[PDB]
Amino acid sequence: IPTVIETTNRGERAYDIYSRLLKDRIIMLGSQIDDNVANSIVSQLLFLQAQDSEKDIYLYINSPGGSVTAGFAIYDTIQHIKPDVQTICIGMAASMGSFLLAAGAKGKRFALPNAEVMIHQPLGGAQGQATEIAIAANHILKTREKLNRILSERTGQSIEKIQKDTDRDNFLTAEEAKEYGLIDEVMVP
Amino acid sequence: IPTVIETTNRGERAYDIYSRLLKDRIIMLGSQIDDNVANSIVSQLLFLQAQDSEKDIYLYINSPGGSVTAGFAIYDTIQHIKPDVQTICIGMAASMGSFLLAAGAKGKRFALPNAEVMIHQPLGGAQGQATEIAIAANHILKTREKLNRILSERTGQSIEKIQKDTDRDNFLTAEEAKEYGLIDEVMVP
Amino acid sequence: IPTVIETGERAYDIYSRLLKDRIIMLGSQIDDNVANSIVSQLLFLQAQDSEKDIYLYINSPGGSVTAGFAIYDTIQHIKPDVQTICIGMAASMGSFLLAAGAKGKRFALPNAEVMIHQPLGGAQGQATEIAIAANHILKTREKLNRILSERTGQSIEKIQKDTDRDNFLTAEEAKEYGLIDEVMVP
Amino acid sequence: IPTVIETTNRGERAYDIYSRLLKDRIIMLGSQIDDNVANSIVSQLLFLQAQDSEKDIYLYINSPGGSVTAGFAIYDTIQHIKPDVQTICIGMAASMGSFLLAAGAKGKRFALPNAEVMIHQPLGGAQGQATEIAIAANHILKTREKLNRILSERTGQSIEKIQKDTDRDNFLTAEEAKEYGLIDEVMVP
Amino acid sequence: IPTVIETGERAYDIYSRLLKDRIIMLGSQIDDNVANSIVSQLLFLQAQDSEKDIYLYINSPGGSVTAGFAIYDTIQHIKPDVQTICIGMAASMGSFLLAAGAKGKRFALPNAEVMIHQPLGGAQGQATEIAIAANHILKTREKLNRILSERTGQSIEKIQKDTDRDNFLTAEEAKEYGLIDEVMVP
Amino acid sequence: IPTVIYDIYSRLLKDRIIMLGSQIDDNVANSIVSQLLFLQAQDSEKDIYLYINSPGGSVTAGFAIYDTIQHIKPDVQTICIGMAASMGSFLLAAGAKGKRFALPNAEVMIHQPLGGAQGQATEIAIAANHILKTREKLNRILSERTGQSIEKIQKDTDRDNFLTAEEAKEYGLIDEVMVP
Amino acid sequence: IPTVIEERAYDIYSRLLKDRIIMLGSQIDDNVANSIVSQLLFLQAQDSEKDIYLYINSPGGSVTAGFAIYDTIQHIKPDVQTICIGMAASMGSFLLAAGAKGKRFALPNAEVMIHQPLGGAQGQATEIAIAANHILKTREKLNRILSERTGQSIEKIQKDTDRDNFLTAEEAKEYGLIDEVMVP
Amino acid sequence: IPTVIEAYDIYSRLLKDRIIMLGSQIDDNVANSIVSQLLFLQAQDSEKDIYLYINSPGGSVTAGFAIYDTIQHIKPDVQTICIGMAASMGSFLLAAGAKGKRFALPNAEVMIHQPLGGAQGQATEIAIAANHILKTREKLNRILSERTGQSIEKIQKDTDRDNFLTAEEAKEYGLIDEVMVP
Amino acid sequence: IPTVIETERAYDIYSRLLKDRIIMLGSQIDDNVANSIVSQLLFLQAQDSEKDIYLYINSPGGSVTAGFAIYDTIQHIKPDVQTICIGMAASMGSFLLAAGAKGKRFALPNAEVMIHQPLGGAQGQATEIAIAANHILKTREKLNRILSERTGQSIEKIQKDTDRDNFLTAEEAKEYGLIDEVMVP
Amino acid sequence: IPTVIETTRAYDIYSRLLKDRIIMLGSQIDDNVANSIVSQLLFLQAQDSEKDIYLYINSPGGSVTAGFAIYDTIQHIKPDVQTICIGMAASMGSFLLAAGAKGKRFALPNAEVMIHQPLGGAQGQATEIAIAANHILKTREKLNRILSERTGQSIEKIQKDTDRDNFLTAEEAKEYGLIDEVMVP
Amino acid sequence: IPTVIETERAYDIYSRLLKDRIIMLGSQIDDNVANSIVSQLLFLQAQDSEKDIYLYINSPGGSVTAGFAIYDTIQHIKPDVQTICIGMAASMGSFLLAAGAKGKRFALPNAEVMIHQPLGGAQGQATEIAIAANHILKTREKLNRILSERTGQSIEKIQKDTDRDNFLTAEEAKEYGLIDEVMVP
């Protein structure tokens, strides 16, 4: 992770690259989505709204996904702050990472021509008693419905198509993610 | 570990202790009930029936429980054979061990005065996709129903009451198990 | 694992005493060792008497498809009828072997469970090694369903739907399905 | 974890992102609650009070819960300081996270529309002597009560309802969290 | 475990040869598996002759409460008198079994020690699951105190005081206390 | 760890505040003593605030802190938040008279020290006598600081004993329960 | 592992051994190989005219251990019938093909797999060349025999074993690995 | 490593001259750094060349494409220089450089091969995994076919097993444009 | 380990072969295997000192020292010991093979034979390392000398030929002097 | 690793030494270390393509690939690169030692130099092993070739002298032509 | 490790002593430690090649190959290098002690010095073990010879005295001539 040195009339600014890009309102979501990661992303979003609440934000996405709970943390913060958030998928947006992909501002969800996108149903787990397991099964189906509902609004697909398409891992080409409504444009070079 | 050696007109007979008890139609269950334990007990019942379809069998029970699947194999085998299986609880009959205790021939279900009986829900687990967890949830619920149903038929208790009393670990004195209908007699002196 | 002695002195362990009455016990996962033993017992029992029925009590969670076919093909191969009796649970290959009992003589105890599902595999390595492996297991799926079809009376396309994920069956349901012929009462 | 560098009279001050947010009286809680996280929140609270005992504090919560003891440290300190503390749940506030969400200054507890809240009874352990197990059991029941007592004060549901409702895992949406009185408003975009 | 022989040919191990003389050696940790061995021997022995005394040598550090009662209850159940003899050590559950022998026939060798203490347990999970466990292990402390009161002559209250922490007794102090009837002199 | 390039404990330290938010081991005690000596050095009359949320730890490391509190010139206020257990509770009690506090929901626990011994009968006799001796040292100082007798303290610490903030005040472990 | 009693007391595999049946139901290592060879030597000693039946359900194993069995089969006088049940793969498949001409069977759902040998080399450049030359030399020994035993050219066997190749019992018959599929 | 705290390390010194060093396995973190460095450099100056040195065993196909598409997306030319080894995904990134500006040093090595996968589970899930990795092989081949001039058929054959190319055979293959002579 | 029952002798399989004077070596050679072979050889002599004994070999080899245990016992006893290699005779496996009775050392047509240096190791002081070094070079001469006598091949050739692993075919081992005849067909 | 501070600014001792055009290679050579060396080389070129570079070498060696990254870079840049062996230059470290500028390859009196064959590994199918074997043999030919050209020895001689571990005295490496002078004192 | 500040120079403690020409060797000697010391020595020579250098020694030792790198650099540089043993200088650590500038090798009154043979190891073929055994003896000779020159003791005597571990009191290291003066008070 390189450092960039910037000079001001007061002294030297030492920026690691992600922090220099963050000065141009660029957020890089480059790993698995978990709590520490959500906390980082949400904080960057809150910081940038403060700096300027009228300028776009660029959320670059290369994530194999992760926690649904952490993704909603991100999602909700996107839907809540004042400036538009463009999302660029580079490489891979799978599961929750493709969810945030579809969560960018209308007209402003991009993917590079070779970016891959995956939609699937969420993974959970339960041990112990018959009632414990039933509580956990009901919770996960409930969050399945929530995810399908929101995706529907975002893509324009019917909940029932989404339900069938996410039944097993479904890999989408950048061009197929446009047909699907997950992204708006494929950024051609 | 020990051995008993017997004399027959035409040679000698070396029996491990459980084998010498089997000859008198006594079966010992003193472990967790996995498939192996199940396979051995079913074999033993089938053998004892093949010797004398009339004479009683004795199944002593000191078992903390195990595979639900392996309980029913024993249970149904006990119901299938012609001889009356007398169930005697020594020490601890827990989980699927008390279920098996209740399976004994009616009138011939016993406990020693200081023997413990525990009844609870079955345990389980699922990992993976939402619809896989739903399948595992539905299944475990269906076997709770199935167990409640058989327990009800044998104890004289209602399904609702068994449903409440098994919600968490429930410990029963031998006389409490007598008063619940899990056993017939507390064997003194 | 108990012993039984009878009159030198015929000293048997419990399963071997049951073999004398033509009873085979499959009460564990089906791996290659278990297959070899069952197969061996089946051959032994044929050599003793090719006319008298054989009784295969089943309580198995399943295992190696390959090891399951060895048993399946041996049952088909020998002369004596092989009755299958499901006790407890017959899952994956267990249920498939259950269905392989001699026609009219496939039984279940009242609280026996049955489960049918897809075979389970794995592949690692080069793209074309993965291809070879996918193609192999899909080819064995077809093989499984076709035999399962013949023996249940169900269509190839129904077994495909019904085994797409874990499908837990009641004894009555398994009779309805074609996997067993009778539920044993009492 | 990214850095922000500001230009001041004195020179060039570089903050980590969470420290830039602290200057705006924002506190972020994104992890489990353990003795270190406790100490850190507490300290940020003692720090903000020192800077301005009048202006509101904003505490964002996305946490799977944790230590009853560390949670209570945070709780007591919110009550102790003069400035109002607004709690905003994003993503997940579970067990002690949700208790803390409820600890917000009345009229000023929020959730984003897809945030989840979970209430359960506390978890613990005990080993060794019968009378050592009793001391651990008595203590966990005393804290269960202390937890219920306060939740009741904070929510307006009774001590007996919370006891029934927290017996197993209980998943609430934000809208149900408003009905339960765990939060005041659901923030809409 | 060496072999003895009786002239077919009777091949024994030492415990099996002592078993012929009605001696049962309990010389290890008390788990369900070991309670099994001991219950069976007792049942077998009652079957061979319900009058002749049975000898229970005890060298155990303790073990499962429920495995202990299994043994304890079977001694009371069967007709023949069980003579308990404490060699080496008998701690906790093994000292409860020591005191469990027929009246007048609980013995210990001059240098045997005996230990009485609280039953040990463990609870994990939710507050309500900790309650159920806590109550269960208070209920079994009482049973053990209760029974031990009848067996020693000591009151419930002294036994509560006396089992609080570990408490090692001399063979002579176990006689005073009422755990054994006599210290066996050469 | 909210950080400026001052971390957050370093900012509170500037206001004479010391946080004890972990097990008491050598390093923690080193850190805390070091802070005590340093704060004494910036100003020897101004109060010190010592917050405690500590499961406890090394008797020895606790003592380094105890004697450092009594040794320096300024008063050290102890404020229990969350839980102060075993050596934490001792440290809570170790603050200046009139200035030992607990927040209304804080919990205190007192007990015996724990320890170990392996090997030869006499090596075990040395370790045994050592632990029995440090128990009396703890029980003695707790008597001088609570107002309870050394006979009532042995009674009370024999097993894990949990006190409420109000019961800690009844008992003399603290002077006040801090409100609101 | 059940017991049978005649008063003589065998385990099932030893009972079957009396009827001249050998079962090969495991990986082929040196121990399994040691035990088959011995069985075949014993059976020859018993009677040299009577056939021997080798039942096969094995995923393979050591090439060098397969050859012990292979060579022992060729060397003894009685004809060894090989029967594939379940799976005969890698070196197992080769041994199946090693049965007496006209006496190589498979059951209808048995599977056959043929592929390259597998090996390893660590160390210096020249130690790796020795291992490479060696394993290539064994690949050709295998091919050449499969060719003598199936009728297929060395060129064809070379290709058809480049990656894992799964055969139905019917394809194994068409290929020459076996003589008959055992119906019914 | 090695450091001026002014931390201002050697790679930071090189970035100042528009040199990006890739000397490790390609995973998400490495890709992120690379992409970020590529975006950073564009923002600085849009018409000056960028130098990406490649000494990589390769790695994640997905991480590789991130860099690839970033290279195609931005405005300035990205020269690729292979040093030592550029294998599987690395060789793909080598081929990815601006046309006429892809280099290798005389002793550098290049290896091309199939993508590497895995698959556990039900028959159907294995089928899904196979189809995807076959779809990613076609995709790699097809791009490499544009990039090299060689056809889809040749590339397919030539990537069947590990294929080790010298720098001079890499020029002949059209993977690089020139061998950097001293 | 299958059983064979005669009439009431109950020899397991290798024991029944021992009855026909057959000794099976089918594993690594270490102290247990060696001790077993020796005991078998001594037993067999006792029974009858004229009749040939047949030792089948399929060994990856093993301990040099355990190899000599076997070798020396073979020479010592009075019966001829014919060595048949089946499958693999590597290292100390092929030494033993070459040690059978002259004119009576065989290999089946597809058997492989590997000859190589002995492997060893040394940790510790410089002086301790030299002691271990000189030992292993001495046992290398010991093996090479015996090899020469048993093959007719010069000690110089054996020194070159075993520098790295050498993989002979049965037919090559025949040429080399390691076996007398290849057992066709 | 100790700091040095300058005024006009803290430095590593290593980047202090880099201000004097000194590069230290004091460890095993894998990609990370090569990367760092290459980068140091390219930086020093940017700072002046005229003045020489001092590359001290204390390495047990490592990756062939990573070594060749350094070797080629040294060849490529404009300035002369002096190589100085202190302590140990083994395997790929000694290949890089003989890679210094003409007349500018040195060793200290007690530096040891070791040359040997490259090491590798291969697992899987015969063909995958053949591919592996052939690639590593191709890298032997490459190494030997470049050594032959620089040391003045013949390919056939370098092959024999690197067959196993060859430890060379500093004087002996001057004889062999790996270095030019032995630095004295 | 604590920080020192100058009005702003933020030195870590070792880097403040490097300012006063003091180098601290406290750990085991390996390729990294040796690379740091060599780097520190080169640096100090460029700053002032006339002023003394102070190498404080407290080490169990480690790699011979690492130590010799430090050894060769000390002799090679212009400044005199004083070596002071604090606590312990074992094996390679005592060798460096003996390597200080004449008249300037010191020890603290309670400093302990141990000398012995180098340790090594070898696994593999007979010839592999011989090559290792050879290298280590050549290493032992070399060590012995350099220790002989520097203490003024014969090769035969150093040979005997280092056979097993030899612990020397601070004063005995002076008679034996490893150090020059023992430093009071």
DSSP, residue by residue, A111-174: E-TT-EEEE-PPEEEEEEEHHHHHHHHHHHHHHHHHHHHHHHHHH---HHHHHHHTSS-EEEEH
**Closest-CA distance of chain A to residue B47, Å:** 36
Q: Least CB-CB distance to E130: which of D131, D136, D167?
A: D136
Orientation of helix C127-152 relative to helix H123-148, angle to 10°: 150
Q: Least CB-CB distance to G21: which of C19, C43, C72?
A: C43
For residue K123, list chain I residues with Cβ-Cβ distance below 8 A: 119-121
Secondary structure class of I145 (helix, strand, coil): helix
> Which amino acid would we find at residue H127?
A
CA distance B65 to B67: 7
CA distance J108 to K71: 10
List the Cα angle E28/E31/E36 in 5-degree steps: 95
Choose, from G93, G115, G134, G153, the residue flagged as catalytic.
G115
J and K touch per CB criterion (3+ pairs under 8 A)? yes
Residues whose CB is less than 8 angstroms from the CB of residue B72 and which lie 6 or more positions away in sequence, other chains included:
C87, C88, C109, C111, C112, C113
Q: Least CB-CB distance to K35: which of J16, J24, J108?
A: J24
Secondary structure class of E127 (helix, strand, coil): helix
Orientation of helix I64-76 relative to helix I31-47, angle to 10°: 10
CA distances to C1, G127, J137 from G120, in Å: 43, 11, 16
Cα F124 from chain centroid?
28
H and D touch per CB criterion (3+ pairs under 8 A)? no
Cα D133 from chain centroid?
30
Choose, from A67, A120, A139, A158, the residue flagged as catalytic.
A120
Secondary structure class of E96 (helix, strand, coil): helix
CA distance G158 to G176: 15
* DSSP state for residue J103 in the 8-state scheme: T
Residue I119 burial by Cβ neighbours in a 10 Å radius (0-12, 13-18, 19+)? middle
Q: For residue B15, give the nearest of B3, B1, B26 by alpha carbon.
A: B3
CA distance E127 to C167: 37
| C interface residues, B as partner, C-beta within 8 Å | 1-5, 7-9, 11, 14-15, 17-18, 21, 23, 25, 27-28, 57, 59, 61, 87-89, 109-113, 165-166, 168, 184, 186
Q: Least CB-CB distance to G23: which of C12, C16, C36?
A: C36
For residue B113, list chain E residues with Cβ-Cβ distance below 8 A: 73, 76
User: In this complex, how many residue pairs, one in chain C and one in chain H, have their CB atoms less than 8 Å apart?
Assistant: 73
Q: Which two tokens stand for residue A183?
A: 């992204």
In this complex, do G164 and C74 lie within 8 Å of one another by their Cβ atoms? no
Q: Which CATH number fits domain C1-186: 3.90.226.10, 1.10.8.60, 3.30.450.20, 3.30.460.80?
A: 3.90.226.10
Residue G50 CB neighbour total at 10 angstroms: 12
β-strand pairing of J53-59 with J22-25? parallel
- The residues pairing with D66 across neighbouring beta strands, listed in sequence order, are D33
CA distance I137 to I140: 5
- The residues pairing with A92 across neighbouring beta strands, listed in sequence order, are A116
Choose, from A67, A95, A139, A158, the residue flagged as catalytic.
A95
Ordered alpha helix ranges (H), chain G: 12-18, 30-46, 63-75, 91-97, 125-150, 154-160, 169-175
> Which amino acid would we find at residue A139?
H
- D39: enclosing H helix or E strand: helix D35-51
Q: Which two tokens stand for residue B91?
A: 């020490």
**Closest-CA distance of chain K to residue J98, Å:** 19
For residue H28, list chain A residues with Cβ-Cβ distance below 8 A: 30-31, 62, 64
CA distance E57 to E27: 8
Buried b (16+ CB within 10 A) or exposed e, E56-92: bbbbbebbbbbbbbbbbbbbebbebbbbbbbbbbbbb
For residue H14, list chain J residues with Cβ-Cβ distance below 8 A: 39, 42-43
In this complex, do C125 and H134 lie within 8 Å of one another by their Cβ atoms? no
| K interface residues, J as partner, C-beta within 8 Å | 6, 9-12, 14-15, 18, 31-32, 34-36, 38-40, 42-43, 46, 65-66, 68-69, 71-73, 75-76, 127-128, 131-132, 134-135, 138, 142, 146
What stretches of F44-136 adopt beta strand conformation (E)? 48-54, 76-85, 100-102, 107-110
Secondary structure class of B105 (helix, strand, coil): coil
For chain E, the residues before each gap (C–N > 2.5 Å) are 7
Q: For residue J130, give the nearest of G119, H155, H88, H89 by alpha carbon.
A: G119
Secondary structure class of G45 (helix, strand, coil): helix
Q: Which chain I residue shows the shortest CA-CA distance from G6?
A: I5
Nominal resolution in Å? 2.7
Candidates D68, D120, D129: best to mutate against E (most CBs of E within 10 A) is D129
Q: Which chain J residue shows the shortest CA-CA distance from G159?
A: J127
For residue K131, list chain J residues with Cβ-Cβ distance below 8 A: 164-165, 167
Q: Which two tokens stand for residue F139?
A: 């029980």
- Dihedral of alpha carbons A135, A137, A141, A146, sign: positive
Phi, psi of J47 (to 5 degrees): -80, -5
Listing DSSP states for F5-17 in one string gives --BHHHHHHTTTE
Q: Least CB-CB distance to A4: which of H40, H63, H72?
A: H40
Q: Least CB-CB distance to A116: which of H8, H40, H62?
A: H62
Choose, from H24, H33, H113, H145, the residue flagged as catalytic.
H113
| H interface residues, J as partner, C-beta within 8 Å | 1-6, 10-11, 13-14, 17, 19, 21, 23-24, 53, 55-57, 83-85, 105-109, 161-162, 164, 180, 182
Orientation of helix H61-73 relative to helix H28-44, angle to 10°: 10
Q: Which CATH number fits domain H1-182: 1.20.58.340, 3.90.226.10, 3.30.70.920, 3.30.2030.30?
A: 3.90.226.10
CA distance K112 to A92: 62
Q: Which two tokens stand for residue H160?
A: 């069947």
Residue I181 CB neighbour total at 10 angstroms: 12
Q: Which residue has the tokens 């491990």?
A: B16
CA distance I76 to I38: 11
Asked if C149 is an active-site residue, the reply is no
Q: Which chain D residue shows the shortest CA-CA distance from E165?
A: D129
Class of domain F1-180: alpha beta
CA distance E113 to E127: 39
Give the 3-state secondary structure percentages of chain D, helix then strand then coil, rounded to 5: 45, 30, 30
Q: Which CATH number fits domain I1-185: 3.30.565.10, 3.30.70.2190, 3.90.226.10, 3.90.340.10?
A: 3.90.226.10
Q: Least CB-CB distance to D122: which of E120, E127, E141?
A: E127
- C172: enclosing H helix or E strand: helix C171-177
| E interface residues, D as partner, C-beta within 8 Å | 117-128, 130-131, 133-134, 137-138, 140-141, 164
Q: For residue F9, give the nearest of F32, F25, F26 by alpha carbon.
A: F32
H106 neighbors H181 (Cβ within 8 angstroms): yes
| F interface residues, D as partner, C-beta within 8 Å | 1-5, 8-9, 11-12, 15, 17, 19, 21-22, 51, 53, 55, 81-83, 103-107, 159-160, 162, 178, 180
What stretches of F21-130 adopt beta strand conformation (E)? 48-54, 76-85, 100-102, 107-110
Query: What does the CA dihedral H59, H61, H62, H64 come to, rounded to 10 degrees?
Result: 70
For residue A154, list chain D residues with Cβ-Cβ distance below 8 A: none
Q: Which CATH number fits domain A1-189: 3.30.70.330, 3.90.226.10, 3.10.110.10, 1.10.3720.10?
A: 3.90.226.10
Contact partners for chain E, using 3 or more CB pairs closer than 8 A, are: B, D
β-strand pairing of E54-60 with E82-91? parallel
In this complex, do I126 and K117 lie within 8 Å of one another by their Cβ atoms? yes
Residues in chain E: 186
Residues in chain A: 189
Orientation of helix C127-152 relative to helix C65-77, angle to 10°: 40
Report whether CATH 3.90.226.10 matches the domain G1-184.
Answer: yes
Q: Least CB-CB distance to E127: which of D124, D128, D129?
A: D124
